[PDB]
Design a protein around this ligand. Structure first.
Ligand code: FM0
Ligand code: FM0
Lengths: 320, 324
């Protein structure tokens, strides 16, 4: 029997991945830039047994659903081909995330599975190839191989499409993210990629957004990073508005949280917001101002709905 | 002695959006717009000028308006007094036959009816152009209400040059209709567009496409090409709402139900009922459809929406009118 266990942390995209150039290999229409979070993660143990008939995934103690079981089986097929065996695996996975709060486990789940498999089957994959393996499960997972800032290079094929870690001289140690708890990303983004009247607008600005953001981290320039990523995040959501037919991930409460962020800026508490495939609002903020910003939120939201996390420096990690 | 006049003006809905002012004081817009004038919804406004009157008075649907609206209306009438070269104050009696509680706007038809009423009362002999200009000062969209069918508001660059005109459609307005999906709300158009215009990160994007949209739209009506019209106006409308998303801080007029309404429109398209939607400063979804499909399209909506929430109107051919 072959087993291994690993922990991967979720990451939030500051420059968004939204829309695939290639649905089967998960190659993106554009590069993305993300930060990896300390607080939320997945621990996954994988066990390969000559005895097993089909792949098993137990998550937080409970067997998973149809589509997920199928989603896992097709993914392990990839792992089997790569490793060169025919072993089925029993996967035991736990998400360390506030429950029923809508946090995406996608990135942390596949990065963790990829790394656990790597360990179990002794593949000694390089980070590049680990990121590649993770990508095949979920595009965002490619980034969770790394800590701090990470960039997913879109490439043009399976070999060239992967993430890498960005050294920012420890800037990530100065930063945090506040979550305000309030249609599938894969399904949402394919509709928008395929049909949206505003998608071209998204493509025309994404590289510049990205360049500006990467420059800002080179200078550890928070306001400048913050401004571009906020703009970029909003433009992603604009594209869904142009889909055929239109849709939104946002609700009034998301807008209320956004308004609170602008006010914090006016009161000289720099922070910037972004949203993914749901109404949750994430507030990038400097650690020094994290408590102050949270207080401003507490005036309006339940304390239980205001959850802060640091940015973790290290990457995916083997659990011995 | 006593000078009175009474007018009926119909509301209009924009297919190409006015959204954002170049001049807040005189209400000169950042771009041209194109609308259609609704047969079913209108305002009737009577104005009576009397030397004895010492202050303008406004009665709306039989009721006091309040010192706020009262003050606002007197400011507007000053414009009329300056225009007429008199100092006569007016008693204004107005009835809105517009589902305002249901969220439809009354300001376009209200200000158009008032402009026309004063012109009739005072015998100003204003051209439709000057009527449009007078209406515009009260509310931009009111400039278009002077006219029936398809109308366009030319933005101009000053108070003399910004006004609307009626577009001759070869009677195409008679083939069209508009379904209103009243959606459970619940930020003014003037204040909203101002925040967006001043502030929105996506406003330039709106500006870079509006003229092309408008030219395509007008070319579409020249040809009575309903699909060509519907497609561009629907994209225009959506782009207008995108800009709000970019404002500092962002906001939307749209709620989940609005999105549900758009979805049904798209199903209607796939199912051979051509129609297209647009939304204004509220979650209500308006559905441009050909008169011959009005009923079929309403029934698709009637599968999910309360019957009282689905209201259709034809498009009127004629413009603002003087009545008894
Ligand atoms: O994370 C980002 O860059 C942006 C988003 O989070 C915004 F919602 C999308 C994530 O995409 P994902 O869940 O990875 O899709 P998959 O490849 O189809 O599994
Ligand atoms: O009708 C349109 O062109 C589009 C809108 O309806 C979309 F909400 C805006 C109307 O603006 P309006 O109320 O006329 O503004 P005012 O000049 O500040 O009174």
């Amino acid at each position: 029997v072959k087993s291994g266990k690993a922990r991967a942390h979720t990451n939030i995209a500051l420059i968004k991945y939204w829309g695939k150039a290639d649905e089967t290999y998960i190659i993106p229409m554009n590069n993305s830039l993300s930060v990896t979070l300390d607080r939320f993660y997945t621990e996954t143990k994988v066990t390969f047994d000559p005895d097993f008939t089909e792949d098993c995934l137990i998550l937080n103690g409970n067997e998973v659903n149809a589509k997920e079981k199928e989603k896992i089986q097709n993914y392990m097929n990839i792992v089997r081909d790569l490793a060169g065996n025919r072993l089925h695996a029993r996967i035991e996975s736990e998400n360390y995330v506030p429950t029923a709060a809508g946090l995406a486990s996608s990135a942390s789940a596949y990065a963790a599975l990829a790394a656990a498999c790597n360990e179990a089957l002794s593949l000694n994959l390089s980070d590049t190839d680990l990121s590649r393996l993770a990508r095949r499960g979920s595009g965002s997972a490619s980034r969770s191989i790394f800590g701090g800032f990470a960039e997913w290079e879109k490439g043009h094929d399976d070999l060239t499409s992967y993430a890498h870690g960005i050294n920012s001289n420890g800037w990530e140690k100065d930063l945090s993210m506040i979550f305000v708890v309030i249609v599938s990303s894969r399904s949402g983004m394919s509709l928008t990629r395929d049909t949206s009247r505003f998608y071209q607008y998204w493509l025309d600005h994404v590289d510049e957004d990205l360049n500006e953001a990467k420059e800002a981290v080179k200078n550890q320039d928070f306001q400048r990073l913050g401004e571009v990523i906020e703009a970029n995040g909003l433009r992603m959501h604009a594209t869904n508005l142009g889909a055929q037919p239109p849709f939104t991930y946002l609700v009034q409460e998301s807008y209320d949280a956004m308004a609170i962020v602008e006010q914090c800026r006016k009161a000289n508490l720099p922070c910037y917001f972004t949203m993914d495939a749901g109404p949750n609002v994430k507030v990038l903020v400097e650690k020094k101002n994290k408590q102050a910003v949270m207080e401003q939120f507490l005036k309006v939201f339940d304390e239980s709905k205001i959850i802060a996390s640091d940015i973790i420096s290290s990457g995916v990690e083997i659990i011995k």
